[PDB]
Amino acid sequence: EVQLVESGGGLVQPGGSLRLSCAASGFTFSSYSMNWVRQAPGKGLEWVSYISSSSSTIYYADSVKGRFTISRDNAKNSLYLQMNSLRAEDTAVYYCARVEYYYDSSGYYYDFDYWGQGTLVTVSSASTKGPSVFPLAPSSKGGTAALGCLVKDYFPEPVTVSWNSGALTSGVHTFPAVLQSSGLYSLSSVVTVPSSSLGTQTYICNVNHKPSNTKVDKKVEPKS
Amino acid sequence: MTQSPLSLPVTPGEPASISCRSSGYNYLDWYLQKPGQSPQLLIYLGSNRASGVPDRFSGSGFTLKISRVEAEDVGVYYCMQALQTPTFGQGTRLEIKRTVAAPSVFIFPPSDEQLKSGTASVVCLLNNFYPREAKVQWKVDNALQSGNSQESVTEQDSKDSTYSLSSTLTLSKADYEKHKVYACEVTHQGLSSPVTKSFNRGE
C-alpha cells in the first residue's frame, strides 16, 4: 500500500526554525511530484509548496516565500520542508500530498491522490509540559454506565488516548482539548459500557503526550 | 487570512449542493475531510468519481451534488482549483439533520488523586444528542456558577449523527472542600424539562 508518514512537528519559539519530513513507501517515490499543504486549527486547507519528481521545478505560496524551503532526497524516499522565521500564523497541521497527473492534446491536469497523516507545528513562547491523568470513575447507577479519563495541564497539543490499548473503541468519545486560563490544555476521554460489567472487566486509558515524552496507562475503577 | 468552514444543514435522504466557493472544468477537484482525518480525493477532472466514491456524488458546472445524503457523508468538503499552483476554497461542513435525540447525562466528582494536588475538576458528560444546541449550567450548594467552567463538543458522529459534550468546572481544593452539593443542569430540545445530575461531596 501507498503510505506517506510525516514527522518533525512540535513546539517552536516564534522566530525559530523547524524541519518537517515525509517518508514515502509502497510506490516509486522518484517518479512523483509532491506538495506540502497546511491547515490552521479550525480553518481551511492552504497550499504551501510544490516540488517536481527530480526537484527541477519548485513553487511556493506567497505566505511562506523567503522563509520556507522545500526539498527531497529520492534515494532516502523523503520529502522535506525547512521552515525558518516562524510566526504565530504558521501554527497548523502540515500534510504532504502526492500528485497524480493527466495529459491530453490540450495540456495537463492533476489532483492530490494520497496524503500523509499530518503533523502539528505550534509556534509559541510557552514551555512544554506533560499532563496529569486522573480517573473519571463509573457512578453507582444496572443500566448503562460511563467512565473516562481527564488528561489535564499539558502543552503543546496533541495527546492521544486509547482504551485497553485499542481493544475498546465502541462508545469512546475523545473530546477536543480546551485551553485553560493558565495556558495549559485539558481534555477528557469517556466510554459508555454496560454497567453490568463494571466489576468483571478492567478498563485502562492509554494516554500519550509525545511533546513531553509522557506515557500513562491509568486504570479506571469505581470507588466504594 | 484563514477561514472557518461553512455549515450546510441537510436532511438525510434529501439532495445537497455544495458550491466551490473559490472567491472547461477539468481543472476542478473535490476533497472530503471526515472528522479527525486527512483530506481524501472525491471528484477529479470536474466530474470523475475516485474509486470507491458512491454513485450519489457527482460534479457539474460549478458545484458538488449529493443525490441523497447519508450519515457517513458528514465532514468538510473542499474544492481545489488545480492550476499552475493549486488553491483550495473555503470548506463547507455538512450538518446531517437527524431526529431529535436527548443527551444521556453523567456527573463525575474530582478524583482523590487530583485533590492531593490542590485543584478540583468536576466533569459533566452529555452523550449522543441532537441537535447541537445543548446548554450546561453548574450549581454548587444551589448557587449558579459563573466564569469557572469550560466545555468542548465532538464533531457529528459518522454513524448516528449525534454530538457529545464535556463540561469541566474547576475549583481550588479549598473551595471544593468548602461546599457539599455539586450539580450540572442540562437543557436540550430532546428533554421536556431540564435534567440535573448531582452528587454530595463525601457521598
Numbering used by the authors:
A (entry chain A): 1 to 141, 145 to 227
B (entry chain B): 4 to 26, 33 to 70, 75 to 216
Publication text:
One of the most attractive TBV targets is Pfs25, a glycophosphotidylinositol-linked protein expressed on the surface of ookinetes, which develop from the fertilized zygote. Pfs25 is important for ookinete survival in the protease-rich mosquito midgut, and Pfs25 assists in the invasion of the midgut epithelium and maturation of the oocyst. When present in a blood meal, anti-Pfs25 antibodies significantly inhibit the development of oocysts in an in vivo standard membrane feeding assay (SMFA). We determine the co-crystal structures of four human antibodies bound to Pfs25, and describe three novel protective epitopes on Pfs25, including the most potent mAb yet described from any organism.
Notably, gl2544 does not bind Pfs25 with appreciable affinity up to the µM range as a Fab and only with 2.5 ± 1.1 µM apparent binding avidity as an IgG; consequently, it fails to show any detectable inhibition in SMFA at a maximum tested concentration of 375 µg/mL. To understand the structural basis of affinity maturation, we solved the crystal structures of the unliganded 2544 Fab and unliganded gl2544 Fab at 2.4 and 2.0 Å resolution, respectively. Comparison of the gl2544 structure with Pfs25-bound 2544 and unliganded 2544 revealed that the heavy chains are structurally similar, with a main-chain RMSD < 2.5 Å throughout the variable region, with the exception of the HCDR3, which displays major differences (nearly 12 Å in RMSD for certain residues) (top). The germline HCDR3 adopts an extended conformation in contrast to 2544, which bends at the loop apex. In the unliganded gl2544 structure, Y100G stabilizes an extended HCDR3 conformation, which would be unfavorable for Pfs25 binding and likely explains the lower affinity for this reversion. The light-chain arrangement varies considerably more between the gl2544 and 2544 antibodies (bottom). In contrast to the light-chain N terminus that shapes the binding site of 2544, the light-chain N terminus of gl2544 adopts an elongated conformation that points away from the paratope. In addition, the apex of κCDR1 is disordered in the germline structure, in contrast to 2544 where the κCDR1 is an ordered component of the binding site. From our comparative structural studies, we propose that there is an interconnectedness between the light-chain N terminus, κCDR1 and κCDR3 where somatic hypermutations in the κCDR3 result in stabilizing light-chain components in an optimal configuration for engaging Pfs25, from an otherwise flexible conformational ensemble in the germline antibody. The very low affinity of gl2544 for Pfs25 suggests that efficient vaccine elicitation of 2544-like antibodies might benefit from the design of a slightly modified Pfs25 antigen with appreciable affinity for 2544-like naive B cells.
